[PDB]
Amino acid sequence: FIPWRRAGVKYTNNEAYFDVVEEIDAIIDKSGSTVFAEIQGVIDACIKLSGMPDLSLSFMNPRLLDDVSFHPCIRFKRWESERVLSFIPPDGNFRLISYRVSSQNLVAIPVYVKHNISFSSCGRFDITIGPKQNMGKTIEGITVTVHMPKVVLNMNLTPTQGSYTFDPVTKVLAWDVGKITPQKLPSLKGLVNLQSGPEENPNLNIQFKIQQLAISGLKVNRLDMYGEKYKPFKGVKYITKAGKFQVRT
């Protein structure tokens, strides 16, 4: 009577991995204040364990987890009573839980954008991106997409790194930034051509990924295995990525 797991699978090396993956949605106003932010997360598992192991995963700060959806292998009663995720896992890859992070704390905002944008047949577009509450972890995979208003015809910008395109039919500017390095912040600056004859500056939509960080602060305490007596490798990795992250200008 464990429906999600057959007996007698044998691996040559017994390993269990968990990946805590958080997506940050935020709207930041033109002064740098958070208008809105929320964090959603998943814990994904990759379980390559022989036999019938029974696992208990616990956290340092389980009060962060709100609105949790559980994989059916989880014994809900032991979460409710001890805040331990106790389960005999399916084999292979599966999503253990999904959650929303509690409102009790503000959301950490791991990047900032300095902007000087003014929109005559000629405007100025200057932005620089940098690390903010990122715990010094590398910010990579950064892209910045901007839906320019109809008045913008074309642009001549200089990226300090990466590359950009501007589509004069869809009016989208897309800057493939790459990663932030310490010595030299990425910036994109130059002039914009306007159709001579503009209320708010355009929003900046940012994608990014940050290894070795769960922006909620979620941290695993222990992973204990019962019912088998071998000593498996057990590890956890954390990553934060942008969901819908927007800076207004």
Partner: peptide, 5 residues
């Protein structure tokens, strides 16, 4: 890459 438990 993974933190060992």
């Amino acid at each position: 890459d993974y933190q060992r438990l």
